[PDB]
Amino acid sequence: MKRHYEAVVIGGGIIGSAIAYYLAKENKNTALFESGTMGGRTTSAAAGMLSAHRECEERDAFFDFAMHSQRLYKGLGEELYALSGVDIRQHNGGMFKLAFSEEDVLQLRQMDDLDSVSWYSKEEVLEKEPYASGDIFGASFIQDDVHVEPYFVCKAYVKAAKMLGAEIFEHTPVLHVERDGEALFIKTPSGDVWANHVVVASGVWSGMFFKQLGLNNAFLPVKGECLSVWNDDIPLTKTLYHDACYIVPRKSGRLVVGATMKPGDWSETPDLGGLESVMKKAKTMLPAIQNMKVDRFWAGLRPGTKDGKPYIGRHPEDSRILFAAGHFRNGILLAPATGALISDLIMNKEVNQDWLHAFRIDRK
Amino acid sequence: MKRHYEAVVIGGGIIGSAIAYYLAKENKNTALFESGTMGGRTTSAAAGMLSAHREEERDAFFDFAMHSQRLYKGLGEELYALSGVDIRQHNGGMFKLAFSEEDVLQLRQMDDLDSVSWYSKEEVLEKEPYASGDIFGASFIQDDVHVEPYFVCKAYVKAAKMLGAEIFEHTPVLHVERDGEALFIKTPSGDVWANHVVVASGVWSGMFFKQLGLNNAFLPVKGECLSVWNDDIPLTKTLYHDACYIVPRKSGRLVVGATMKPGDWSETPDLGGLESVMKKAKTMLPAIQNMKVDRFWAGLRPGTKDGKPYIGRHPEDSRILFAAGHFRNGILLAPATGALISDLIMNKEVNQDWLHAFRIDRK
Amino acid sequence: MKRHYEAVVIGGGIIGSAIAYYLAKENKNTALFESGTMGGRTTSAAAGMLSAHREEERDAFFDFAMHSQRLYKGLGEELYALSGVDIRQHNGGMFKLAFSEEDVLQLRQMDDLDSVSWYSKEEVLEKEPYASGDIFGASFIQDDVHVEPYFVCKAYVKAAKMLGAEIFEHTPVLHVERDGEALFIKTPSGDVWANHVVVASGVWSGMFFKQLGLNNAFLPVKGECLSVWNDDIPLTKTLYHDACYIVPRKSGRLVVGATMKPGDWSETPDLGGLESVMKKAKTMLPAIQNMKVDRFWAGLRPGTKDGKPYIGRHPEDSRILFAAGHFRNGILLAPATGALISDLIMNKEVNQDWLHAFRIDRK
Amino acid sequence: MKRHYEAVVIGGGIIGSAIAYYLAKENKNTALFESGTMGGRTTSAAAGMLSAHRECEERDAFFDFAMHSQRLYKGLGEELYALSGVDIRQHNGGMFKLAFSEEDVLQLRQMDDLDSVSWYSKEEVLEKEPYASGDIFGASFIQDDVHVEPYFVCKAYVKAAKMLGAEIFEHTPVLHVERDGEALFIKTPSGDVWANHVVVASGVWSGMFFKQLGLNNAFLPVKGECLSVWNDDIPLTKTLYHDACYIVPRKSGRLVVGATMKPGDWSETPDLGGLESVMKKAKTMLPAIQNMKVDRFWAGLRPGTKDGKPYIGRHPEDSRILFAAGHFRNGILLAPATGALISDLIMNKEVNQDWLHAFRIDRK
Numbered sequence A, D: 001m002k003r004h005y006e007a008v009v010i011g012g013g014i015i016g017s018a019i020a021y022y023l024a025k026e027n028k029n030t031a032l033f034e035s036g037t038m039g040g041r042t043t044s045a046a047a048g049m050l051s052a053h054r055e056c057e058e059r060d061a062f063f064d065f066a067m068h069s070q071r072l073y074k075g076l077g078e079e080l081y082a083l084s085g086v087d088i089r090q091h092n093g094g095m096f097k098l099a100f101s102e103e104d105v106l107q108l109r110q111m112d113d114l115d116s117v118s119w120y121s122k123e124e125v126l127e128k129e130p131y132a133s134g135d136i137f138g139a140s141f142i143q144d145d146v147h148v149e150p151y152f153v154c155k156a157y158v159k160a161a162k163m164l165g166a167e168i169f170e171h172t173p174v175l176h177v178e179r180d181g182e183a184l185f186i187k188t189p190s191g192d193v194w195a196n197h198v199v200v201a202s203g204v205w206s207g208m209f210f211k212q213l214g215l216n217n218a219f220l221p222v223k224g225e226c227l228s229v230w231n232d233d234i235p236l237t238k239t240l241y242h243d244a245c246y247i248v249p250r251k252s253g254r255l256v257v258g259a260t261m262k263p264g265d266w267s268e269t270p271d272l273g274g275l276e277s278v279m280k281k282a283k284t285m286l287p288a289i290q291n292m293k294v295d296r297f298w299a300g301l302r303p304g305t306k307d308g309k310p311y312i313g314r315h316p317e318d319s320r321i322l323f324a325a326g327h328f329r330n331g332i333l334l335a336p337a338t339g340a341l342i343s344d345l346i347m348n349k350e351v352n353q354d355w356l357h358a359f360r361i362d363r364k
Numbered sequence B, C: 001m002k003r004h005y006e007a008v009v010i011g012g013g014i015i016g017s018a019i020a021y022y023l024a025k026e027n028k029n030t031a032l033f034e035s036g037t038m039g040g041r042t043t044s045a046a047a048g049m050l051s052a053h054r055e056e057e058r059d060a061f062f063d064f065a066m067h068s069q070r071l072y073k074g075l076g077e078e079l080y081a082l083s084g085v086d087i088r089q090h091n092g093g094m095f096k097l098a099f100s101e102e103d104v105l106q107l108r109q110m111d112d113l114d115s116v117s118w119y120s121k122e123e124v125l126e127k128e129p130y131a132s133g134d135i136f137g138a139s140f141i142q143d144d145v146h147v148e149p150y151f152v153c154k155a156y157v158k159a160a161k162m163l164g165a166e167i168f169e170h171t172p173v174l175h176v177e178r179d180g181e182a183l184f185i186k187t188p189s190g191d192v193w194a195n196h197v198v199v200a201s202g203v204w205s206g207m208f209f210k211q212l213g214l215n216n217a218f219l220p221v222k223g224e225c226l227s228v229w230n231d232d233i234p235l236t237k238t239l240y241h242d243a244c245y246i247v248p249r250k251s252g253r254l255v256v257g258a259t260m261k262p263g264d265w266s267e268t269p270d271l272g273g274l275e276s277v278m279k280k281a282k283t284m285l286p287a288i289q290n291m292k293v294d295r296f297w298a299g300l301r302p303g304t305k306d307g308k309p310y311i312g313r314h315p316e317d318s319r320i321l322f323a324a325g326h327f328r329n330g331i332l333l334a335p336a337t338g339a340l341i342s343d344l345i346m347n348k349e350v351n352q353d354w355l356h357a358f359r360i361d362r363k
């Protein structure tokens, strides 16, 4: 460990990893501190859908940033693979947003006008995925709402960063950021470090730093419980989606299935009721999944915010301190765009101003 | 691995392990052959309740079960002395819950028994305050205890080993040959002579029956299970209802099961099966919703035409014995099964009702 | 989660769990906060030997260790009654082997002790025939037993819970604030007042010392371990030598360790470390070569400047107590640690030598 | 389960799976029986090196068949991915066959003349892999000795086969093959099945069937113990090889490390001495591996034969019965060629005759 770095990233989930990579690409002398292991928390629980077309939202700055981050994924695997040897495991099968009611059709067809989205009838869906529940009314088909394996996106980024010269310290919690001196300094159990810039990327645990730094931004965990099966019997290429729940086909023959929404619950292992409700929901979407062998079960804490958007930007009173946290259901999608934005801000480059405003810290 | 043994045991689940111990205890130069690892199959999937009181009619089967339940009395200490292995015995007891009047009536027929009592809703809820508030009371059975089946199995085999028995894991027996003055079996590592052969291969035993001119068939009844951590509530007694159960282990885990899928040979749980085990558990113990899941698993109960095991001699050849088909009660029945098979080999006198009830040629 | 507790315990390893039980036993309205899961850290990685006889000099530390070893006497039954959790106690005892004359000499200095005897090569090999044939004999210590540390931890916490203590997993404490008429701590889920705060955060305790104007430092000494299945040989006693050990569990597993890597904060084993644990084990028990590996793991021993824990009051503030830095002996010391912290809070009189040896301001 | 199939494959390792796929491609009504799960035995233990240039052998029929099977891998992933959704996880990093002595150099340079093999000096190796042991004398570099994940090759094949119409029955041991009737029939615990052709592909357990069928072909298990680490710190693209031991970099950042040779040992979990010796050997090849975190440990039974080559072909007295078993250290490499050969023989196509002879059952 050195005394000084030009930039310091606090937290080693996917968000922190992207930032570290993107700073090291700019040849900034960078260090990242992580409590446990890289990707060991909410990043590991994640399904890895790169879904910008959710929750079929309004067309705002949040959506453009999503579409943009989705674009940045196009050569990302190849880019990071060349430097890290780590494959992010990209699957380009696409997505069916299923409908089970007339009200479902109606709401989904409010997107048909986007060029990426077309509408399929009951018959047209089943032509492509015969095992989709027979009770469906049709589906929104999205070509670009693909997926990746979040753990490995995280490992590709951090490995790539190391190779570009970044310093990674696992098992090193940051206890405090200060704040007063000419330079910033951070305290660890292995002693202190000085920095020209500090990025807080500690997901749902980021409140500590906000408060240490005179800010009242709070985070609310929303726990999500998932499970996986082995699909040894059925063809399934497209991700099936309904009402925030999903069945995601992996390149291994596993299906990733989720998920519960449990606000205020900080626990990181599934309880019995959670898994039960996930299993019940999955069968309505793909009946054949009931005969599939269970593989793993797990949970993770989505980092919730008061308005549901992340905080990505400078401390309103100190340009040296940045935050990148609060990616609720979409931290995997947004990881590259978050990483690029943070890096550009630190380099004093000019950034999209709608994005700066949307994810600013001081939102009154 | 020798050329000859006095006795060969084929299969190292709880049953085969037991037989081998009783044989070794009698100074019979004994070998055991197991395809995989000791206890690695159905034995591993079992909850380990010693429940004889399962009513319906009190026949030969019932006596044998009660006799075996008695045999578990000093077993733990006995095997621990020889093996260093704890069978993890738990003396809490069992409540067989009632959810209807029909339930109450059927359970009250065991009342005459000394080991059984009826409890009312209010009396059950004093003892287990977290049992479902929908219960109409429960049959309490103080002596229907539980063990950890894997460790009973490991205890026995390690004991037999200390008594001289030779154990061969990763050694499938391919054929038993009956023709000559002595028996022999075939394995991939060579062929071994024997004076007695015991077939203890659980649901896979059919292979050998057929080889030896008998048409005895086994049907697997797959059972899926899960465990949760009970970190929050007191629960001393096993809860039971309609063949499902919640069993508190001395680790703080709860063992919960089980499905019943006949004709399925798969040994890992399906999603639908695990879903129904969770549904059922919640009806017995509502708080189970909020307990963190630990593990999920499955195994194959060895079913037979009439529900009863085959324990005894080949009707044409007293050198050959079978010990397979302990449906929902293989753990309970293992000590008595072991002692019976051993006694028969040794030509001792045995209960002739038990001999008749578990015989090979039935119709 | 309430606004106020009489006592708050920060950390749920074996130590914090113990403290919480003793506090709850005294009817103190008690809360415990743990970052992860109860016992999920160093406590989980510990072998669980109760070894006080570790010579060198017999000081205050030694008495305390012996006192704690006495406290384990009815503990298992005591905690089982309240919790339903078995601490998995094993009374086999320990051989501290000798491989040289230097070895013999150093070990023979404990001879005067009543709980200790010397055995010759031939006497050790009668008892444990598989111990290395290179031994020059061993110090036998009948009462240096072992437990399963995770379950001692779970036993205590579940007991405290049954006595009224409120437990909060997944709840890191971020700050202790000292300024006002009463203490408070800060958590992500809100802030809580307290009359006493106990810091029991193992190797991570430094955070709090600093916050509270004290410069006490912790150095982790990582220890890597493995387990094998002993399916083939008798082994009742623990084997010990030069801080490495082989411990037989009542499951049939052997627990083997350990490395000593100071300044390493990683909690999973490296390859080099596991290689050296295997090398060492084989020198003590050659047959271990042929035993199938089960698991490998690691944890961080909480080291201090002088090797001793800090157990006691903030020298400036009697509302604040510390219980951290039990280097190689946190499991052994947990009952006495729990009773000491509890007694201090309750203002009872305590051994003043022990109070002095484990005090916070040392130099 | 049906009464009759045109062909029946006994055993569901990689060999059996390839055969099932290749028969189903020819639209033969096919069934495969497996005791446990697909790929659950020796196929799962395997490293997945597709190495034809071992043990730097003589240039014979065995070698050509290997080179050929290696060629068949070129579009195999894409071929099977289109039908199964399962990625075989192909890595094209290549191989260094390291030398630690003058005798090592000498023996390795007996291959320089092959166009696929060039020689690197100590310096040239370290230029590419700085972490290779400094005690090396140089290395044979092989561009095409790539690798795959054997479990998934096996799953891709079996899934592809199902889609082509094949019937897969896991948890169904074959008890007996007979033999006498007009048609062949096999006995399972779920009852009997008739077949026009029977393929024995039961790896190291195949002796049973040879003997049931009047043949004395024996198999000797050679147990192999392996472990994996996480390489989070070091660049490593090339497989390192020395004296039958190996460090294989996976696309996940794991390194696969092996292996012991234990003849006559039928056990399928590592013992302590085995793993110790694997760890000791690995450090001499890549010193930095000693600081790497352990992940998994496992073992498998190589299916040995009297002469070290497999048996791939017809029963010398019955054209309806075939065997494909005894791929010692190279079943993953040879899986496609074995599958193609068996299928062609069953279809009475004309096959390479040197290959037929080399792997014939009756080798006196």
Ligand SMILES: Cc1cc2nc3c(=O)[nH]c(=O)nc-3n(C[C@H](O)[C@H](O)[C@H](O)COP(=O)(O)OP(=O)(O)OC[C@H]3O[C@@H](n4cnc5c(N)ncnc54)[C@H](O)[C@@H]3O)c2cc1C
Pocket: A010, A011, A012, A013, A014, A015, A016, A033, A034, A035, A036, A037, A038, A039, A040, A041, A042, A043, A044, A045, A046, A047, A048, A049, A050, A051, A172, A173, A174, A175, A201, A202, A203, A204, A205, A206, A223, A224, A225, A226, A258, A259, A299, A300, A301, A302, A303, A324, A325, A326, A327, A328, A329, A330, A331, A332, A333, A334
């Ligand atoms: C079941 C589930 C499914 C999901 N599926 C998707 C999906 O399909 N697509 C999608 O885009 N998103 C998904 N998400 C959301 C996604 O997981 C999150 O938005 C994202 O992982 C947040 O990334 P992060 O790096 O901010 O958080 P984390 O991965 O939680 O990382 C934060 C890191 O900071 C570390 N840290 C905390 N405190 C400190 C400290 N004091 N010092 C040092 N380090 C510290 C933590 O240890 C942690 O490793 C899902 C979430 C769940 C729960």
Ligand SMILES: Cc1cc2nc3c(=O)[nH]c(=O)nc-3n(C[C@H](O)[C@H](O)[C@H](O)COP(=O)(O)OP(=O)(O)OC[C@H]3O[C@@H](n4cnc5c(N)ncnc54)[C@H](O)[C@@H]3O)c2cc1C
Pocket: B010, B011, B012, B013, B014, B015, B016, B033, B034, B035, B036, B037, B038, B039, B040, B041, B042, B043, B044, B045, B046, B047, B048, B049, B050, B051, B149, B171, B172, B173, B174, B200, B201, B202, B203, B204, B205, B221, B222, B223, B225, B257, B258, B298, B299, B300, B301, B302, B323, B324, B325, B326, B327, B328, B329, B330, B331, B332, B333
């Ligand atoms: C309280 C209680 C709870 C129970 N719960 C369950 C439950 O939840 N689920 C359930 O399924 N059952 C349950 N059971 C009962 C079940 O009967 C036992 O779990 C099981 O019967 C053990 O019987 P076994 O030793 O005959 O079979 P197994 O344990 O299956 O052992 C047979 C052994 O034979 C070996 N073998 C087979 N063929 C060969 C061969 N050719 N050569 C060499 N070896 C061979 C196999 O490898 C296997 O290890 C329960 C029983 C009780 C009493």
Ligand SMILES: Cc1cc2nc3c(=O)[nH]c(=O)nc-3n(C[C@H](O)[C@H](O)[C@H](O)COP(=O)(O)OP(=O)(O)OC[C@H]3O[C@@H](n4cnc5c(N)ncnc54)[C@H](O)[C@@H]3O)c2cc1C
Pocket: C010, C011, C012, C013, C014, C015, C016, C033, C034, C035, C036, C037, C038, C039, C040, C041, C042, C043, C044, C045, C046, C047, C048, C049, C050, C051, C149, C171, C172, C173, C174, C200, C201, C202, C203, C204, C205, C221, C222, C223, C225, C257, C258, C298, C299, C300, C301, C302, C323, C324, C325, C326, C327, C328, C329, C330, C331, C332, C333
């Ligand atoms: C026979 C024997 C064998 C042993 N073997 C080993 C061994 O092999 N390896 C080894 O490493 N040690 C070993 N030990 C001894 C070791 O001292 C114990 O394993 C350990 O000390 C338990 O101590 P603890 O409860 O203080 O720490 P831990 O078990 O580490 O518990 C501290 C807890 O505090 C929590 N925490 C930390 N910070 C916060 C916060 N800010 N807010 C809330 N919670 C927090 C952590 O989550 C952690 O769970 C052994 C001891 C004995 C007696």
Ligand SMILES: Cc1cc2nc3c(=O)[nH]c(=O)nc-3n(C[C@H](O)[C@H](O)[C@H](O)COP(=O)(O)OP(=O)(O)OC[C@H]3O[C@@H](n4cnc5c(N)ncnc54)[C@H](O)[C@@H]3O)c2cc1C
Pocket: D010, D011, D012, D013, D014, D015, D016, D033, D034, D035, D036, D037, D038, D039, D040, D041, D042, D043, D044, D045, D046, D047, D048, D049, D050, D051, D172, D173, D174, D175, D201, D202, D203, D204, D205, D206, D223, D224, D225, D226, D258, D259, D299, D300, D301, D302, D303, D324, D325, D326, D327, D328, D329, D330, D331, D332, D333, D334
């Ligand atoms: C540590 C190790 C590393 C290796 N690395 C490599 C490598 O890098 N490259 C390479 O090319 N090779 C490697 N190998 C070799 C390779 O694993 C084998 O050559 C290959 O897997 C053999 O394939 P198989 O399908 O014949 O055998 P298996 O995968 O063993 O399959 C045989 C199947 O038949 C089934 N079966 C058995 N009996 C019956 C029955 N009676 N009824 C029904 N089914 C039955 C079994 O259950 C099993 O699933 C390695 C081996 C080991 C042990």
